[PDB]
Amino acid sequence: LSDDALMDTVQRRTFLYFWEGAEPNSGLAPERYHVDGVYPQNDANVVTSGGSGFGIMAILAGIDRGYVTREEGLARMERIVSFLEKADRFHGAYPHWWYGDTGKVKPFGQKDNGGDLVETAFLMQGLLAVHQYYANGNDKEKAIAQRIDRLWREVDWDWYRKGGQNVLYWHWSPTYGWEMDFPIHGYNECMIMYILAAASPTHGVPAAVYHDGWAQNGAIVSPHKVEGIELHLRYQGTEAGPLFWAQYSFLGLDPVGLKDEYCPSYFHEMRNLTLVNRAYCIRNPKHYKGFGPDCWGLTASYSVDGYAAHSPNEQDDKGVISPTAALSSIVYTPEYSLQVMRHLYNMGDKVFGPFGFYDAFSETDNWYPQRYLAIDQGPIAVMIENYRTGLLWKLFMSHPDVQAGLTKLGFNTN
Template sequence: MLRRNLIYFLVSVVALASCTPRKTDQQTTSADTTAHISDDSLLTLVEARTFQYFWNGAEPTSGAARERFHADNVYPENDKHIVTSGGTGFGVMAILVGIERGFITREQGLERLTHFITWLEKADRFHGVWPHWWNGETGKVKPFSPNDNGGDLVETSYLLQGLLCVRQYFKEGNEQEKALAGRIDKLWREVEFDWHRNNKQNVLYWHWSPDKAWVMNFAVEGYNECLIMYILAAASPTHGVPAEVYHDGWARKGGIRNDSTHQQYGYHLDLRHNGAQQYGGPLFWSHYSYLGLDPHNLKDRYADYWTHNRNHTLINYRYCVENPKQYKGYGENSWGLTASYSINGYAAHSPAEDLGVISPTAALSSFPYTPEESMKALKHFYFDLGDKTFGEYGFYDAFSEHHNWYLPRYLAIDQGPIIVMIENHRSGLLWKLFMSAPEVQQGLDKLGFTR
């Protein structure tokens, strides 16, 4: 692994202090601004800042990731202490990156993760499944909507994806590290994926509530961001589901395949994207399930997932370069459409829902798929746009040059993929950890994946 000691990191921070983003009153060229910092150092700096969202920015009682952080201090009522299960799954992966990159020591990471697991063991869950949101101070569920006040199997799967990486990281360590790995293993084994078949149907349901039961009625079919849920459900050593749940439910008895030969910008999508077939859905569909699940050479009867995700990203990129709606600021150095804050609240940006808003997480979390295009975007966001887009916890969630809209706000579920996927691009750290779990390998075998 890439363990760097803390002293090296502190020296690097001093060296990078002169490289803070410039004000944009006078635009500077790439040649003017990049001569004094290497691409590798810039990636480390971005990782370090983004890491702080999950470290200094964590909710203090739980140690979990806050749903949001607004540097302008404008929040929805009673929102600062709300934490997110999925975003925390990304956050525990970020802590492992922090250890490996020397941002914190191994001992500090172990202490924080142990603190969080102690809180998590007592927090609300439903048949072992965690809610989308909790009150970080109490561990009680915070309803995501009036009928969504129980278990959220998709967000739980994002959390488990991260926790299994933590388990694998510490399982051969000292006594305290092994104890943490064992506690995580117990939580993993208690998640009742089979309960979410809703009376043994061959599909998984997203939500269940103790007083609303299955009223949300959301059977999860592909393709969208939820592949990891089905893989973990197949992999569960205690509450696993048969392969038919994947093939009949998620894959819709083969209906997930895109049998059309149509290409967009010369790229084909192997899978039918729900509601967004022409260009593909928001880019987070190629990020969230693949923070731990390594798409390299990953294939089943429906798709080659590396090719599919790369093509999805390149279609999104080419669309922004073409810029058919003629938005100011779009181009080969400024691209990326995905779900994020927007000019009117929150939106699932994609070529099919293009509002002139760029979300930095889209391009930056795509580094494994499009390293050259993503690096150009990173440099533009950092050097050219400067403190309009970069702050205490890394790049802000979204911006629009067209609408002159720059909001200094962050969302956990967008920050996490940035640091995790940049690190996967650089070292494969989280991919190696997650794929080393024997249950994951067994689950993939059960579903007919090759890799």
């Protein structure tokens, strides 16, 4: 089985999470999919906005490869856009969750019952990619693009500055206001939210919002070594974050040759964060079964005792490998990621299920859940596509508002 053949199989099955596993009314990605049919939160119909952005990009890659016909793919995009035009919005921003059948918000926590700007950014990164795919298509495709541009123009990023501060807040509630009180400072998984906030052709934010808020005037630059590997940035509350922090903002945003005032190369920073993750698993100081060069990758996912923000350190390491971590880093470490992909595939049905690799597993605890999460499946399909053809990067980087946003914030590609 060639690397191309293996990638084709992993891509086709991961695509089926979003094609066949979608909530029927919305056509969107449910937060989770349990092969066992047992849902502790009884939320099979609860759709995630962020994961749906990844899912929409996963469906786009499928259409381009011919997994579904041009007509079938357009019928799905139309269904998704119709749901988004109707579902609950908070100053144009989308909540973390909705009930897929009604489009009503599902609070992600008591006071988190409104807009979630980070999740809105992950959805918009996907929608701008579909916009660029259909912008020069037939008349029906161009009409779909026009509807997407209206949703994009309706997101009021500037509102989330909480009365003109030079920072973006994560949440806003119509009942609890600003009570979640989370201003977003880098570095974490949320960079694309500041790039899209600056890109908005209607409610765009000043550059000061990125320089004073995200970068905190250079405080985001903090060179340090982790596992003998040099990292350039300050990671929020950690020496090296979970591997998804190197992936979510780079599904559409092309890291190759990307640089700005705070990082001479986002590609090399994220490659090093991947290498730190792999180095920790190879070291395996907690002596977990299976951890090594063929099996590595620590990120946030289901865990033996529930859900956990796994990261490459002894406090967050629980003996749980999440296939999304190593596999969505294929664009940074092609050989090491294909090594884990080849090894995970050879473990059989216990980890490679109907909609691709299952969320997480522990060889030590003999814990092999037959469960998926949209946010872990999404990056696998998109990063394999970007590695193979650069499709999602080409589409997203071609958007004129995105290009103006990158220039505004001082980003460069060379």
